[PDB]
């Protein structure tokens, strides 16, 4: 029985917590138009500058237009008062990929191959939009498994973005202009985590140690533990220091490893 409702009446909320984050709580809900169960997410209240809420309002209109089989569906968003912002997405039945990896040690390469191809197809959708969407937070916790066939979808786009010149600019300003290639780097880290069932840069104690590492040529210790050389070679071409030397997503999907269907 419902404890909350959308203004249009389409979406119902049930008081059954299915996920928990530090600034967001995920409840089970229902789409009464399609009679499918949905995910009802309550996010912590945020500042209401007039220009910001017109931006959120219009960014959510774009998000609910993004229909693709390897992206978690965004249905609606509106403001409410449980004490906040309410978000309704597609319900992922089999949890996150990190949950699968936390349960087993050696993923089989048919699954490595199938699940990564879907992640790439989903990233390729985002990067060919107008303007393109850069996810910026691709990780195994933001990748979900759902349905009877075990379909793989990318979710949680909360940190994504769209798309004179200063004379005396500091080096951080010059390298600050990044592009979709940061998602290729992140994909390579996810594939590394799938092929090793180890967290990359586990040995480190902070993110400061992590940066100085990639820069001198020290890849995660888990990289030199990758069994299949074809997978290893895909990973290094994904996490290359210089972005202009990396795979594009299209070349990844043209790779012999992903052209196989097994
Ligand atoms: C597509 N499918 C899926 N989308 C999500 C998803 C999307 C948004 C949000 C969350 C999850 C949780 C946090 N969040 C928002 O605060 C937020 C809410 C509404 C509008 C913008 C927001 O953020 C700013 C922003 C700006 C540009 C882009 Cl491109 C994206 C987001 C899950 S499945
Ligand atoms: N659409 C969804 N469908 C099903 N479960 C979801 C969905 N979104 C989130 N969850 C659950 O919520 C958890 C994910 O955590 P999340 O909502 O990202 O909070 P968070 O910890 O603040 N963000 P992060 O630490 O970056 O993962 C998992 O246990 C998921 O099962
Ligand atoms: Ca550690
Ligand atoms: Mn998340």
- Ligand 1 within 6 A of CB of 60: yes
78-83: list long-range contacts, CB under 8 Å, 24+ apart: 78/6, 78/7, 79/53, 80/4, 80/42, 82/4, 82/42, 83/45
Asked whether residue 135 falls in the same domain as residue 253, the answer is yes
Give yes or no: residues 82 and 97 share one domain: no
Q: Which of 60, 90, 120 is the last residue of a domain?
A: 90
Report CA Rg, the chain: 20
Residues 178 and 231 in one domain: yes
Which CATH number do you get for residue 71? 3.30.200.20
Total domains in the fold of the chain: 2
CA of 142 to the centre of ligand 1 (A): 12
CB count in 10 Å sphere of residue 52: 11
Cα 68 to Cα 18: distance, rounded to the nearest angstrom: 24
Answer yes or no: is the C-beta of 70 below 6 A from any ligand 1 atom: no
169 preceded by cis ω (within 30°)?
Answer: no
Instruction: Measure the N-to-C terminal CA separation of the chain; round to a whole number of Å.
Output: 45
Same domain, residue pair 52 and 10: yes
Cβ atoms 132, 123 nearer than 8 A: no
Give the strand pairing for 4-5 and 151-154: unpaired
Domain that holds residue 5: 1-90
137 is annotated as an active-site residue: no
Give yes or no: residues 143 and 62 share one domain: no
Answer with the one of 36, 71, 90 that is the final residue of a domain.
90
| Domain boundary pick from 27, 58, 90 | 90
* Mutation choice for ligand 2 from 26, 76, 101, 186, CB with most ligand atoms inside 8 A: 26
Phi, psi of 52 (to 5 degrees): -70, -40
Q: What angle do CA 14, 79, 96 make, to 5 degrees?
A: 55
What approach was used to elucidate this structure? X-ray
Is the domain of 249 the same as that of 208? yes
* Ligand 1 center from residue 227 Cα (angstroms): 36
Q: Does 243 share its domain with 118?
A: yes
161 lines ligand 1 (CB under 6 A): yes
How far is residue 36's CA from residue 144's CA, in Å, rounded to a whole number?
18
Query: What is the 8-class DSSP label of residue 135?
Result: -
Q: State whether 83 and 108 are in the same domain.
A: no
Ligand 1 atom closest to the Cα of residue 60 is 20
**Which CATH number covers residue 204?**
1.10.510.10
Please tell me whether residues 72 and 156 are part of one structural domain: no
Helices (H), 5-108: 50-63, 97-101
Helix (H) or strand (E) holding 187: helix 181-196
8 A C-beta contact, residue 117 and residue 35: no
CB proximity list for 150: less than 8 A, separation 6 or greater: 94
157 annotated binding-site participant: yes
Q: What is the resolution of this structure in A?
A: 2.5
Are 108 and 221 members of one domain? Answer: yes
Element (H, E) at 4: strand 4-5
| Distance in angstroms (rounded) separating the CA atoms of residues 171 and 174 | 5
Q: Which residues make Cβ contacts (< 8 Å) with residue 234, sequence separation at least 6?
A: 188, 191, 247, 252, 255, 257
Q: Are residues 85 and 43 in contact, defined by beta-carbon separation less than 8 angstroms?
A: yes
Residue 213 and residue 152 share a domain = yes
**Residues 54 and 14 sit within 8 Å (Cβ to Cβ):** no
Of 156, 179, 183, 251, which one is the catalytic site residue?
A: 156
Tell me if 5 sits within 8 A of 13, measured CB to CB: yes
- One domain for residues 237 and 111: yes
């Amino acid at each position: 029985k419902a404890v909350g409702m959308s203004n249009d009446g389409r979406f119902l909320k049930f008081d059954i917590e299915i996920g928990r984050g530090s600034f967001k709580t995920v409840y089970k809900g229902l789409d009464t138009e399609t009679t499918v169960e949905v995910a009802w997410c309550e996010l912590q209240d945020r500042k209401l500058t007039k220009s910001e809420r017109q931006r959120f309002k219009e960014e959510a209109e774009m998000l609910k237009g993004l229909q693709h089989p390897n992206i978690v569906r965004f249905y609606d968003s509106w403001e409410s008062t449980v004490k906040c912002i309410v978000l309704v997405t597609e319900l992922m039945t089999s949890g996150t990929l990190k949950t699968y990896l936390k349960r087993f040690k050696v993923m089989k390469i048919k699954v490595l191959r199938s699940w990564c191809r879907q992640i790439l197809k989903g990233l390729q959708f985002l990067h060919t939009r107008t303007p393109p969407i850069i996810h910026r937070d691709l990780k195994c916790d933001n990748i979900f498994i759902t349905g009877p066939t075990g379909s793989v979808k990318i979710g949680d786009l909360g940190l994504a973005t769209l798309k004179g010149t200063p004379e005396f600019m500091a080096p951080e300003m010059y390298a600050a202009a990044y592009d979709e290639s940061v998602d290729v780097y992140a994909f390579g880290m996810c594939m590394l985590e799938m092929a090793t069932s180890e967290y990359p840069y586990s040995e480190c104690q902070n993110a400061a140690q992590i940066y100085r590492r990639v820069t001198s040529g020290v890849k995660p210790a888990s990289f030199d533990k990758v069994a299949i050389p074809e997978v290893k070679e895909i990973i290094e071409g994904c996490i290359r220091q210089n972005k202009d030397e990396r795979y594009s997503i299209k070349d990844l999907l043209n790779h012999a490893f992903f052209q196989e269907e097994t």
